[PDB]
Symmetry: D2
């Protein structure tokens, strides 16, 4: 332990011209998300970038009927936003940094995330990224059911809707027993 | 083929003197939940009662630190509330009706629910019970990841928090692509 | 730390009049299996009895077409054989000893075994019971995929087919990287 | 309506110069494995190539049990024989998949179950190597996930004849699998 999970913080989710952008609140966490990721890496944590990898005209994916095309394979939409992308440029080849393609909201679903964590005997996951109430929430619930201790970096998660953001934070703390931390990985009270 | 999942509609979650009761809003759905369950049964659907089964002094359960003791094995707290309980006494021994003990919020986690459904080639699960934003939500997300079509019986789910109930219904429809239905199993628009 | 898994060592699998008995070879391990289980318990290990729980006229179970009825719920066939049964009568109520019903061959499939092990941060499982090439093999493979270290108690596993017993032992050592141990929990070289 | 799973039929497992080759018995199924895959595809079945993707990784417990094999970006991962030609022709088809795997089972840490569930597939047809290792593990996972199982007997192989026979017997008698030939006809 520990492992930091970086969820869908890409151009399509964050940039103003993004295909499924969260806009201003997503852009606002850029400094915090890059700071906390660098900090975790510096102290010896494993870093998992778990990124949507969709195909256009995938009729068998139930998500294709719910949202417009986003994070399409081979497009600039899948590029990491801001200084987080710079971090991946510098340290993406490191043995402790991973890139994982995902098709569901949860970073665990149909991936080998659990396997890689169990290989390294990680007991605690630290969650960052977007959206708080969709891919972060699904990931947190999967992590809970798989018996991981959970930390949520409050200033490094965001949603389009403030009320959905608040529901999710409340769910993490009160139902999942997750620890809410700041960008310095210190517990928030 | 379809299965109705009846989540935690017991004394401890519903009755006034219940140890972890949702109170009035949970009691309010008693007529709707019993009606829809009898209807699904009449239509030849499978019925799964997925019920919290906790032990006193379970130090290894993360839930024991978050909530007071509830649905303890061998106590009246685990008895089904209202006409739903009467239905179980009348039809519990039918080959299409199941009682399933669970320890996490999701009906799938550490149970053989997925196995029983796949044996019967079920492609659609119909969700009822409490709480909308906790055991129903977790069950719905697990169902989504496992590739089931989902129906939510809107008048047969309840939470102690109205805002959380609203978040969850929105999440089911917009994120999971679930169908919202009434107590007559007719789609709501 | 460690968990010992006791697989299907019941009257139906072991006794002369057992409905699906492995007969003499299964009876031959009675001393070793009871000894190793008592030893593991004395060393502070967790003990999981993972026992077939079948229903008669379960037409949805693929196993019902392959084998005659066995380990039927509520029958004497599910009673633990030999001194193992005495151990359970003596220590079944200890917080470290578990009884788990299962429907597939693997002790993990449709059960909460993985959950209970993760709760206790168990990294290694010790396998005992019958049959070596069926419920032991399936359980070992599931354990491997879930990232557990595996120990096999060679004198405390048995099959009705000696060639199959040999295949399984070889598979455990060479393919799964399991440690073969004796009834004193000492590694065999 | 069904899905054929093509397990690890690559240069490293099959060719004489292969890093973890099964040799002659693996080479012997080349004609049958290519024929049955083409037939399955022509019928409208989904085809999943599930292929070992290893890194020369200390956290992988398999690295202490076998020499390096099927390394990412190497020619050891190329499909052997006419099967490779089929992939050239139809690899970009929406019904044909290439899945990297790190465990023996094609299901473990992959999205195989998800893709099958999306397509409402109820039956998997297993081909490839080794009968008693990546085929056996895949079959056991399929069984636990509730799939009907077919095994193409002439399109599976192992290094050891006794292990091959154990596995075939296990599939038929324990998992309830149907044994079929290269024409996808049941064997009796
Ligand atoms: Zn997406
Ligand atoms: Zn509970
Ligand atoms: Zn059995
Ligand atoms: Zn390999």
């Amino acid at each position: 332990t520990k492992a930091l999970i970086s969820i869908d913080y890409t151009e399509d989710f964050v940039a103003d011209s993004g295909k499924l952008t969260a806009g201003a609140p997503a852009q606002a966490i850029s400094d915090a998300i890059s700071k906390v990721t660098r900090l975790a890496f510096e102290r010896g944590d494993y870093i998992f970038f778990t990124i949507d990898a969709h195909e256009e005209n995938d009729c068998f994916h139930p998500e294709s009927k719910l949202f417009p095309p986003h994070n399409l394979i081979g497009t600039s939409g899948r590029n990491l936003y801001g200084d987080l992308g710079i971090f991946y440029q510098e340290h993406g080849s490191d043995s402790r940094v991973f890139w994982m393609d995902k098709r569901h909201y949860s970073a665990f679903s149909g991936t080998d995330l659990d396997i890689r964590l169990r290989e390294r005997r990680v007991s605690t996951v630290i969650l960052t990224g977007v959206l708080t109430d969709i891919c972060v929430l699904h990931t947190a619930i999967d992590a809970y059911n798989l018996g991981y201790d959970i930390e949520i970096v409050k200033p490094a998660v965001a949603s389009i809707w403030p009320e959905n953001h608040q529901f999710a934070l409340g769910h993490f703390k009160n139902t999942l027993g997750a620890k809410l931390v700041d960008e310095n990985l210190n517990e928030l009270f």
